[PDB]
C-alpha cells in the first residue's frame, strides 16, 4: 500500500488510505503533478509529464489575489478530473472524507502560494453548490508542508468571507475532524473578541453578530460559553466582556498580522449566484 507522495519539491508521508486504483494502491510511492494533480507510477514517468504539463496553477477563476497568495474557485463539473484528483490527494491526510467520484455538485476553493516556478498548492476547502443545511465548508485541508503556519485560519476565514459576500450565515459540515474542531474553536474566538472590541454599544443580539461575521448563531453561543462570557444574574442573560481575553487578543493581533497571515476583503474579486 501507499506510504509517501512526491508532491513538487516535497516528499510527504501519507497519513491514511485513499481509494486510488489498485494498480497504484499496490505501490508504496506515488508521484503527483504538483499543478494538474495527475498521479504517476514513477519519477521517470513524472518528469516526462512535467515537461509536457502546462499548468502553473489550478484551473477555475482566481477570485482572490494578494501578492503571491491566491485562491482559485474550481467548478467540480467544469474540471471533473482536476477535482477528483484533488479529493484522492486530500483523502490521505484527511480521515473522514466521503466524496471522491462525483465532484459535480461542489465548488472547490484552492489556496496557492506563488514563486518563480508557479502557484503551489497550500490547501483547499470544498463547498456544496446547494447545501440543504447551509454548510459553507464541506471538507477543508492544509497540505502538511504548510501546517502550523496560520494558513488553516486563512482558509476558514475565507469560507466565511464568501458567506458574507453571499449575505449568508453558514457553518462547516458536521462531523468535525478532531484536528479541525480546535481551529474553528480558535477562529470563532478571534472573530468574537474582535467584534466586542469594535462594538461600543451597551447591548447586542446574537443575530446581529451572526449577521456581521457570518458565523452561525449556535457556534456563537458555543464560543461565548467556551470563553465563559455568557453569564446569568438577576433573571437574564448578560455578555461578560473579559478584559483579559480582550487584552490578550490585542497582543496576539500584533504577533499574527506582523507575519501577513491574514486574508483581505479588499483583494477579493467575486460574485455569488
Amino acid at each position: 500500500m501507499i506510504k509517501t507522495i512526491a508532491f513538487g519539491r516535497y516528499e510527504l508521508d501519507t497519513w491514511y488510505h485513499s481509494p486510488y486504483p489498485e494498480e497504484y494502491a499496490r505501490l508504496g510511492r506515488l508521484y503527483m503533478c504538483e499543478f494538474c494533480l495527475k498521479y504517476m507510477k514513477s519519477q521517470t514517468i513524472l518528469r516526462r509529464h512535467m515537461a509536457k504539463c502546462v499548468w502553473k496553477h489550478p484551473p477555475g477563476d482566481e477570485i482572490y489575489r494578494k501578492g503571491s497568495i491566491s485562491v482559485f474557485e474550481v467548478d467540480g463539473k467544469k474540471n471533473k478530473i482536476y477535482c477528483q484528483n484533488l479529493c484522492l490527494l486530500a483523502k490521505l491526510f484527511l480521515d473522514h472524507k466521503t466524496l471522491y467520484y462525483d465532484v459535480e455538485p461542489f465548488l472547490f476553493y484552492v489556496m496557492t502560494e506563488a514563486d518563480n516556478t508557479g502557484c503551489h498548492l497550500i490547501g483547499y476547502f470544498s463547498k456544496e453548490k446547494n447545501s440543504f443545511l447551509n454548510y459553507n465548508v464541506s471538507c477543508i485541508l492544509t497540505m502538511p508542508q504548510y501546517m502550523r503556519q496560520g494558513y488553516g485560519k486563512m482558509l476558514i476565514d475565507f469560507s466565511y468571507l464568501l458567506s458574507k459576500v453571499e449575505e449568508k450565515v453558514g457553518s462547516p459540515e458536521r462531523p468535525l475532524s478532531d484536528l479541525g474542531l480546535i481551529s474553528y474553536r480558535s477562529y470563532w474566538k478571534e472573530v468574537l473578541l474582535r467584534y466586542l472590541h469594535n462594538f461600543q454599544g451597551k447591548e447586542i443580539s446574537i443575530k446581529e453578530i451572526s449577521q456581521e461575521t457570518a458565523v452561525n448563531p449556535v457556534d456563537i453561543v458555543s464560543t461565548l460559553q467556551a470563553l465563559q462570557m455568557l453569564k446569568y444574574w438577576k433573571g437574564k442573560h448578560l455578555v461578560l466582556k473579559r478584559q483579559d481575553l480582550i487584552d490578550e487578543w490585542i497582543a496576539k493581533e500584533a504577533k499574527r498580522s506582523n507575519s501577513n497571515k491574514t486574508m483581505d476583503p479588499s483583494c477579493l474579486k467575486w460574485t455569488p449566484p
Binding site: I206, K207, L238, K241
Partner: peptide, 28 residues
C-alpha cells in the same frame, strides 16, 4: 431561535434575537 446548555450546575435557554446586555466587572 432558542439555544440550550449549562452555566455552573444550572440549565439555561436563550434567544438569539433579544438584545443581551454587555457588562465589565461590577456587583455580580
Amino acid at each position: 431561535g432558542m439555544v440550550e446548555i449549562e452555566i455552573e450546575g444550572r440549565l439555561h435557554r436563550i434567544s438569539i434575537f433579544d438584545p443581551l446586555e454587555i457588562i465589565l466587572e461590577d456587583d455580580l
